[PDB]
Every structure is written in C-alpha cells, then in structure tokens.
Amino acid sequence: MGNRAFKSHHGHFLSAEGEAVKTHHGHHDHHTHFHVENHGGKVALKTHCGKYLSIGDHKQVYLSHHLHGDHSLFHLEHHGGKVSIKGHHHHYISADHHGHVSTKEHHDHDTTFEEIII
Numbered sequence: 001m002g003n004r005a006f007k008s009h010h011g012h013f014l015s016a017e018g019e020a021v022k023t024h025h026g027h028h029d030h031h032t033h034f035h036v037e038n039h040g041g042k043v044a045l046k047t048h049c050g051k052y053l054s055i056g057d058h059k060q061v062y063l064s065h066h067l068h069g070d071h072s073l074f075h076l077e078h079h080g081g082k083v084s085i086k087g088h089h090h091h092y093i094s095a096d097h098h099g100h101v102s103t104k105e106h107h108d109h110d111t112t113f114e115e116i117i118i
Contacts, residue, residue, distance in 0.1 A: 002036035006083065007114035008095030014113070016047045021063065021101060026116065036115075039068070042075040045085070055087055059102040082112045 005013030005024070012023040016032035035046045045053035047063070054064035054072045064072045074093075076085035084107060085093040091103040092111040104111045 001117075002034070002115055003118050004033050004116045006034065006085070006095075007116055008101075009109065009113070010097065012095075013116050014093075014095060014101060016051075016063075021061070023095060023101070036076070039073050042070065042073055044073040045076070053085075053087070053093070055091075055103060059099075061101055061103070078115075079112055081114070082109075083115050084112045 005015045005026070007013040008023060011025055013026070014034065015022060015024045016034060017024070018032075032047065035048065037044055037046060050065060051063040052065065052067065052072045053074055054062050056062060067073065071088040074085050074087045076083065087093070087103070089105070091105050092107050093113075094102045094104045094111045095113065096102070096110055
C-alpha cells in the first residue's frame with residue numbers, strides 16, 4: 001500500500017522523473033511518485049499508468065509494462081522498520097550513494113530502504 005517513494009538511506013528516495021528513474025528527497029511537485037500494490041503471491045511496483053520496476057542484466061535497471069511473474073513484478077517485504085525489494089536471481093534492489101541504483105545479491109542496509117507514503 002504505497003503512493004510515494006522508497007527511501008534509500010541518507011534522505012533520498014527512488015522516485016521516477018521525465019523518462020527515467022531518479023532519487024529525490026520529497027519536496028516539490030510530484031507526478032512521478034510510486035505505488036506499491038499486491039499481485040497474487042507477490043507485490044508490484046507501479047508508476048501511475050503503465051510501468052513496473054524492471055531489471056535487465058549487467059547492473060542495468062529500468063521499468064517495463066504490465067505482466068505476471070517476478071523481475072518485473074516483485075517480492076518486497078518489511079524489515080523491523082525498513083524494507084527490502086527482491087526480484088530474480090535472488091537479488092534485492094540497491095541504491096548506493098556511489099553507484100546509484102542497481103541490485104545486489106547481499107542483503108543488510110545497502111539493499112534495504114524505508115517506505116514513504118502520503
């Protein structure tokens with residue numbers, strides 16, 4: 001149940017923007033927020049009209065259309081106070097100061113975020 005963004009530490013949260021994914025605080029404007037919603041045995045990441053978190057390979061990360069499965073639709077779960085998102089190959093999503101957003105096989109904080117709502 002979410003209609004805003006995911007905090008990846010420090011104070012920035014994955015958000016969408018123009019034709020690409022970015023990380024912002026909260027702030028101005030809008031319109032490229034992000035919605036969590038369930039899908040059968042897992043959960044989906046969906047921006048407002050046609051787009052679901054998607055991962056390519058080689059640390060390349062983007063967003064695809066509607067579909068069923070994992071990789072695109074995801075399995076994401078809470079963590080005490082934080083969150084963790086996971087898709088294919090046993091990787092979780094990552095957001096690292098140094099290498100922006102990608103995914104990692106490990107799982108501790110670097111691949112664990114907050115949940116921000118409205």
